Enzyme design. Sequence first.
Site, PDB file in Angstrom:
ATOM      1  N   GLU C 156      69.458  18.324  55.242  1.00 40.77           N
ATOM      2  CA  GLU C 156      69.970  16.833  55.015  1.00 40.77           C
ATOM      3  C   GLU C 156      70.521  16.376  53.746  1.00 40.77           C
ATOM      4  O   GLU C 156      71.147  15.285  54.018  1.00 40.77           O
ATOM      5  CB  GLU C 156      68.658  16.026  55.480  1.00 40.77           C
ATOM      6  CG  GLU C 156      69.013  14.431  55.824  1.00 40.77           C
ATOM      7  CD  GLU C 156      67.994  14.006  56.783  1.00 40.77           C
ATOM      8  OE1 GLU C 156      67.511  14.698  57.513  1.00 40.77           O
ATOM      9  OE2 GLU C 156      67.649  12.719  56.242  1.00 40.77           O
ATOM     10  N   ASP C 230      65.151  16.909  58.392  1.00 40.60           N
ATOM     11  CA  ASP C 230      63.520  16.345  57.916  1.00 40.60           C
ATOM     12  C   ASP C 230      62.798  16.278  59.516  1.00 40.60           C
ATOM     13  O   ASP C 230      63.405  16.360  60.389  1.00 40.60           O
ATOM     14  CB  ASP C 230      63.767  14.889  57.421  1.00 40.60           C
ATOM     15  CG  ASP C 230      64.514  14.975  55.955  1.00 40.60           C
ATOM     16  OD1 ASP C 230      64.635  16.115  55.518  1.00 40.60           O
ATOM     17  OD2 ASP C 230      65.091  13.877  55.575  1.00 40.60           O
TER      18      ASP C 230
END
Lengths: 521, 520, 536, 87
Positions: C156, C230
Amino acid sequence: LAREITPVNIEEELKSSYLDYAMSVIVGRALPDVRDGLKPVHRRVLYAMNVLGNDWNKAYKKSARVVGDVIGKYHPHGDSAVYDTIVRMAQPFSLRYMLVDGQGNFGSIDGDSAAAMRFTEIRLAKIAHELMADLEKETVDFVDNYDGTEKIPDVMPTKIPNLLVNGSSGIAVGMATNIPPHNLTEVINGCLAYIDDEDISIEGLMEHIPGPDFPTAAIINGRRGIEEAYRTGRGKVYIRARAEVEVDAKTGRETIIVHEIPYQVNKARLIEKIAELVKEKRVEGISALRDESDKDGMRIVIEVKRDAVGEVVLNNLYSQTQLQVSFGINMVALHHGQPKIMNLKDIIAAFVRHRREVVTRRTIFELRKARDRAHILEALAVALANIDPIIELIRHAPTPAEAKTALVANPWQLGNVAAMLERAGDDAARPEWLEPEFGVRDGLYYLTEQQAQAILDLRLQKLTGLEHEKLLDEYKELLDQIAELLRILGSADRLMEVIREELELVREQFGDKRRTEITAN
Amino acid sequence: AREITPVNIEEELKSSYLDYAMSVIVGRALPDVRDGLKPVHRRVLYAMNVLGNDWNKAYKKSARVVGDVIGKYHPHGDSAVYDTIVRMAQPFSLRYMLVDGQGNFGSIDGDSAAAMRFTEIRLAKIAHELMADLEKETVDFVDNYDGTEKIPDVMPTKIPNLLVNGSSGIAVGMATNIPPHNLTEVINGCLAYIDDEDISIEGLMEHIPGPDFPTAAIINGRRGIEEAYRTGRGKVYIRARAEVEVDAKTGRETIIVHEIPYQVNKARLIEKIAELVKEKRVEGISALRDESDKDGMRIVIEVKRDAVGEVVLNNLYSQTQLQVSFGINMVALHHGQPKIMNLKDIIAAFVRHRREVVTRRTIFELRKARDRAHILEALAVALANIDPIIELIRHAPTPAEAKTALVANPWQLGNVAAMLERAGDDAARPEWLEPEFGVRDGLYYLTEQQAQAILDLRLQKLTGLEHEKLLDEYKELLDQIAELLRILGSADRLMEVIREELELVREQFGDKRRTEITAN
Amino acid sequence: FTNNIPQRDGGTHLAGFRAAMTRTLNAYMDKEGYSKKAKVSATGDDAREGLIAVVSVKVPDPKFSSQTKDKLVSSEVKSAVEQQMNELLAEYLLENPTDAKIVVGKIIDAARAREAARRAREMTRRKGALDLAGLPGKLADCQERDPALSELYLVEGDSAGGSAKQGRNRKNQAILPLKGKILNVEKARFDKMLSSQEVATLITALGCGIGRDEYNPDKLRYHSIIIMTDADVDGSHIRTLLLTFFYRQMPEIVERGHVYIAQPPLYKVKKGKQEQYIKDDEAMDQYQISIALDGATLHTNASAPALAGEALEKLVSEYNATQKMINRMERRYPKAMLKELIYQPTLTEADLSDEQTVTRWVNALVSELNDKEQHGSQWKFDVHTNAEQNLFEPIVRVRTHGVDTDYPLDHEFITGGEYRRICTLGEKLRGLLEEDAFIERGERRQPVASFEQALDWLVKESRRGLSIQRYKGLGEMNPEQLWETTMDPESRRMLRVTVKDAIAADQLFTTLMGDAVEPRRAFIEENALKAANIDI
Amino acid sequence: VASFEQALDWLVKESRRGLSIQRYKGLGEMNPEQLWETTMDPESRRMLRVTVKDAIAADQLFTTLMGDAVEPRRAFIEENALKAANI
DNA sequence: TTTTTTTTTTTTTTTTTTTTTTTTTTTTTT
DNA sequence: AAAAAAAAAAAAAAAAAAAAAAAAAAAAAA
């Protein structure tokens, strides 16, 4: 089987992930709760400030400390967004009634951004304390934080209708809310009218609440949009600027003076747009353009050419540039933890039900506290009546535990002072959980373990003559308080009386004048 | 009170630049010789200690610690406090980390640490012993920038943090660069200094042969170390651990770099080797890889068949950053002024700091023990004569009248109180107390504080066991007062206490050498 | 086995056994050079092929995932088994050459079969120190040149990128960190695909510029693309956006099965020595229940034996399911009424014909509600005579917060299914707690008057030493923790993305991710109603 | 009291009872009205004209304090520190 | 007269860059 | 040989951008 790799369908993974995200956003960042009118971010920020002690009559604290406390404890979503929320809460051109008192640069309607987190300082406003009144009296449900190491309120026990008053605006996934601000006096008058008659029409609620009231004063063009919004929860409202057409006495030239601009309109962007329209020959008759906002108003001068009507130019500016904007009302809020399109009467009814719940919970907590203190005071009075044999028993005992057992086992005579004390309100003044084994039983008082511990914790300072009368006076005051609380809990009319008195006090303290003008069209 | 007043450009420039120079030199750039910390490190550790970021407690988010430091103590904005916290947390920077962080805190490869909202922060175990006996007024507390709080002027350290963790900072006029050292060797040097205060630098060199970088490596020379530890300035060359591995099957060789010099980035090193190969400034290199498999590091440099390999390794040492010249410049604040100082000066300053800390701690503990013994004398005398005291307190109308009556009445000594009080004799009364009060001709004269303590006495303490508890506490306090007075009276006992503390610190945080000193 | 108790679902000892066996066999293969001669690297499930083993352990204080005892979640056991295996299996391999050579021959045959199963491919130029090959500066590429052995991790950001880069295997793992949320290609125009974030993924995969006349999936540089975002809500959203990009722009890659999904944990929970990783909130709830029933005994009488662990687990599971149902039914009726209906006698449709019985039942219910009340509400009953069906439906009035409301228990509510489940749980819990009942958690003793008190006490005692670490992205995980959980192929738990039905997938993508909002809102509302109305 | 130190300490401690200091870490912490009152309004302004008394001395000071060479800067800072320490 | 793409909210996810200051080295340029 | 210029170590001052997720108004393509 605990296999390293398993199949997953593209449909199932997409559906589960996106539904999880959509429900999370809808319930937990985007829409406000109808009761307290706050999003979770605002709720957590105000709770952090209250726990720190950022009182309205205390020194400012730096925004970095408050943001760090919010991020570390309650709200795990990055510090920049939290500081932006604090900035929006502090600045007065955003909220009708600011929940945060700012010290520094927090931006302006001219388009200037706020100072960084390390410069500004914040402090709760006086309105935010009444937005969190009786929070300590278990008037609202507390829920765990992300770690589970702390507790956060589920909702604030507000005294102000914050949803109607300050409005809201958010973009969920499926939904999107947009609620304008309102005048607190008008909203409280509507609430009082609803309390007086719960079968009140939207026509009566509109008589008490003519329309929205933005922090930036302006003109609302029509009323059909207001009526549609307040009877259905949706409707378009046109907001105009308070422009004029000044005519010089000496010369025939004219000037247009924009005293105010609509809500959520940037002065710099508006001036740039007007300049672009003049440069592109979209709008004719504009001789010049400047700002003269000298901190005594908001003056925008738009000079008119000699060969121009001026009023025609003003109408063209209203049509083309952002001096007139449409506010699309969409009254979507969380009710019972789900989104719902709701009208004015629904919001007022939800607020009044919340006030009912808060006052009932507060009275229950206060009654329990008063009864426990009365129990302890009965123990102390009975012990001071028989202080000599109690001292002999404690001296003879080896350890405090043996003293506790002796005190519990031995019934005690009241004496004259305790017998006279324990006459009025003998019923409906004991704690509810106490069994009938303890307490007064034919004169002989029977102590509990807690009462024996309280007696052993008694100090020699309280054996003086004055402190005995102090305990008697405290017991009488607690009896009167218990009687009043029971009277509140018994009668539903007295609950409405208390709520109406609180709302009248709130209207008196924080009353304000209407800023906008709802003109007919 | 003119609106406009002329000022010379010379005076304005001089005043402004001297304010900046003195502020940087005193506050931010250089460390203090005693605790070895800058104000940023001191305020960060104090904020974490006040928050309660104990080494065994759970972690806390780095954002909370940074916000607490900025809001209360440090007026210089976030994103530098977090950088200092990151440097203190990561092990390849500090020899003994003062912070125990969780998450991505960077690496020798050159990865930056995670942002403030991701990591979590907690004190190291050694950081607590760096702040031991802070509560016992062992150091002076300086006011906050707003004046709302107070910060320590210096920590009461037990570790020689300046020599141990080193330092590196740049001031306006000066610039410090102190390497780290091994804690066991530095403590041995301190103990040797305590044993013989007139010790030459050769003995401290025997105990402390040289610096011990967190990244293990090889130090070529020793004259640079000797010059640094004599004059406070010297040049040290730090070599990499590289071995030319000859394959058994075929004659091709590969150079495997096991360890890297201090403050050298692996990514920049590999980039520079690639640049030298592409520009053909270093011949003989066939391939270049990194194979650090989380078991140290491993940089494989395949040598061509038409190359010696040893020559290639020597060229990489000479040209590339496998050798770095670490310029020692031991500048630190001494009595609030910068000063170049050698090894013995630093050790002597640390020993003086420990002398002051132990003396102030003993004075504080003696005062506390004497006050508690005074209150226990009051409580024992009250328990001896509880009956007339109960009578007087009952008959009085208000607590103030009861205090006046108790102070006015001289009280008979009970038999247990008579045996208790006369045994102690002097050396237990607090110094501030006048001779009017206390025992006088077998009659105890209470004070106002003693009368207030008696009125605050609970009925729980009238039991039989609590009297024995008070007696035992009084005897223990008499023994503690005797020990504290013995420590304060003699100067040899002060050094015995300091030596025991240093030996315990060496026992707890002992560590082996990482770098190697060689003769070349 | 653990103390001569079998473990069907393995446990920590099984993971330690697998890790040690794989490590020792790989080290032996590398040392003797059998891998070089065969030109193939052994992997997991080949060293375990055709194997028989028995792993008996004797722990003094074992800790299991459940009272059924199918998993051992004791953290102490894995390290000891790993160390002993890593020593003694290597010693066995050194001493016995013939059997080791035979086993290596079997492993090499399995590896050759696995390589033969794969499809044709070409070795790809990789980013290196000497040569960059025109790849992005943020790509931490691997050393393997052959695809089908390499694998790309899509993370991410740069903090998660650093956490993954520090802990990985440089031979195989490659990492390409993105920048937060990416373009929604369903909404975005094709000209908007020329963006910095999306062009980085296109360059690294080497499927050309996702055009009709250039998209060639045969030149894919990694045959295992892993979406390791995540472990939270925004990570799930970014995962959905990435799945939109892969399905819409490169559908052949999804069809061939190169797209994978990692499952990093959201929570780490520790109690003294023991530690454990938890994925989601339901797993957290199951873990809390497991600790609550860990070493917990329930006595119905003062002198009676403790109940069975599995039976108590079944009771707690039924109770929690009914409580979730009651929370769902908070709108229809008060929670206090629904909780009280568990302990009351069942009321059948035949009872509705009689009037006196219904009055007695509702009177007893309201009396018990009034007795145990601890708020301002007041309960009263009323029976409505339904002349149509000759029934007598009870009605319970409540005046809570000064507001009076009626909750008639209709004929449908008695046979509504929800009341059936309430009646079944009641029938389980009519008399499982006498006056002298108590529970123990070691030396602690606690008399309990109701099942709620016992459950609350067990939960409170469970949460004494509990500490929870929520990871707000992979930047908060240490590189060792991120390696051990969801980068090591031994301890990996991945999901292969596949398309069950192309038409349904296209419709779902268009509805959830397209421009039109009305189908998305309708879909969300319908799924919310289905979740709320699980129980009839 | 019995000493001037005690009296001064008591006076200062009573001075700092209700006191509250707000340190401004730059102009972003001041309100715009506070900026106007202090140092923008020509009525309540306090400015200073930069002037050059001597060109040569100014050039020497600028070169020493701001030049590349560090040794004259260190000498100047040390001399000013000693001057401040002395009378 | 009608599609299509662009701006604006306000909570979320992500990163990026420019100077001061002093030693010491490495380029590169004469 | 010689000078000049660039980079990097650690605490300070400053700032800069890319996307989701709804509604609702411009402002061009068609």
